Amino acid sequence: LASALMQAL
Ligand SMILES: *C(=O)c1ccc(-c2ccc(C(=O)OCC)cn2)nc1
Ligand SMILES: *NNC(=O)c1ccc(-c2ccc(C(N)=O)cn2)nc1
Ligand SMILES: Cc1ccc(C)cc1
Ligand SMILES: Cc1cccc(C)c1
Ligand SMILES: Cc1cccc(C)c1
Ligand SMILES: Cc1ccccc1C
């Protein structure tokens, strides 16, 4: 999950 969001950065 964290990665799914952090892809933005
Ligand atoms: C959420 O974006 C998220 C959570 C966890 C993972 C993930 C990817 C790969 C592994 C892995 O290779 O585990 C080997 C023990 C674990 N967790 N991706 C995305
Ligand atoms: N928000 N994330 C990024 O902007 C981002 C772009 C690209 C990468 C990355 C990481 C690792 C590799 C590699 N070939 O091992 C390539 N590109 N990380 C973050
Ligand atoms: C965990 C996280 C991912 C993306 C942004 C833009 C901020 C925090
Ligand atoms: C969406 C996404 C983020 C990070 C890494 C992978 C393979 C996919
Ligand atoms: C998918 C991803 C982007 C930026 C930083 C991290 C740790 C993960
Ligand atoms: C599985 C994974 C997730 C996020 C960043 C790098 C890697 C190897």
Side-chain angles (χ1 to χ4, degrees):
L1 173 64
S3 295
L5 277 56
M6 285 188 195
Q7 69 178 310
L9 305 180

